């Protein structure tokens, strides 16, 4: 069918040092996809980096992960064709100092756990989960995006401990700031707990999880009459108490988050 491979770039979806993502609409079918555009000339290692990110994206196929359709190289430019999520970023559904309705946060939290369980099941950790990277489709289904920091932590049934310091400070687990090596899975569980805090309170609990940060010390001392905790009902707060545990070995795992009381409370009506 002539022209079915032509796509018009009609809108900037996102921009950053990594490059940009544009909304692409098919010339013939008007199908919409997002196209991430990367100039491999921007950094000496961008070549290996983007190659790794495409490798990882090729391994993924889950309803709560941004689908990867393929890629094309044009000289120094790499074009990644990705699932377009018309509801934009979860970031923009979080009202400052309010958050969002608890049942809505619970449904987004269920979908985030589903995508994270999927990734960990195939041995991939994301390493930078935050609202800016959790996208929404036309029906508000959540899809994890941006595997630019993703890496394999399990291969051939053997776990590799991680040591790279990466992520975003307000969402990063405390063991990355205190230990030379750490397990991957608890770090992604932690950032999911900060995302839940933001969805239910509309504010991040601390600049970083270190004793030097007063807000983090206050949490460790269970001062839950202070914000953001005072804004969170008791049932989800009990779940946050299990997720935001400094020792990653005592931190709740996803199979136990799935058994949590708040997690299983009927709260949200179907669309």
């Amino acid at each position: 069918v002539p022209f079915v491979e032509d796509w018009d770039l009609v809108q900037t979806l996102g921009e950053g040092a990594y490059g940009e993502v544009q909304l692409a609409v098919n010339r013939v079918t008007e199908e919409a996809v997002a196209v991430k555009i990367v100039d491999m000339k921007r950094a000496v290692d961008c070549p290996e980096n983007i190659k790794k990110e495409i490798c990882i994206n090729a391994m993924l196929n889950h309803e709560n992960v941004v689908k990867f359709y393929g890629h094309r190289r044009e000289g120094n430019i790499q074009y990644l064709f990705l699932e377009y999520c018309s509801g934009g970023e979860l970031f923009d559904r979080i009202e400052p100092d309010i958050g969002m309705p608890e049942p809505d946060a619970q449904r987004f939290f269920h979908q985030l756990m589903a995508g994270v369980v999927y990734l960990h099941g195939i041995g991939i950790t994301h390493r930078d989960i935050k609202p800016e990277n959790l996208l929404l489709d036309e029906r508000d289904n959540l899809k994890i995006s941006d595997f630019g920091l993703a890496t394999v932590f399990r291969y051939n049934n053997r776990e590799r401990l991680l040591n790279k310091m990466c992520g975003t400070l307000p969402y990063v687990a405390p063991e990355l700031l205190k230990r030379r090596e750490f397990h991957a899975e608890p770090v992604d569980v932690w950032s999911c707990g900060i995302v839940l805090t933001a969805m239910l309170a509309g504010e991040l609990p601390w600049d970083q999880p270190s004793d030097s940060c007063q807000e983090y010390s206050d949490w460790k001392e269970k001062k839950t009459y202070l914000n953001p905790w005072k804004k969170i009902d008791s049932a989800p707060l009990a779940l946050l108490h299990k997720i935001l545990v400094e020792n990653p070995s005592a931190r709740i795992t996803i199979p136990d988050i799935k058994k949590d009381r708040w997690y299983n409370k009927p709260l949200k009506k179907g669309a």
């Binding site: 079915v4 491979e5 032509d6 796509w7 018009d8 094309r72 074009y79």
Partner: peptide, 5 residues
């Protein structure tokens, strides 16, 4: 701006 598939 455009791209081919």
């Amino acid at each position: 701006a455009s791209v081919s598939a």
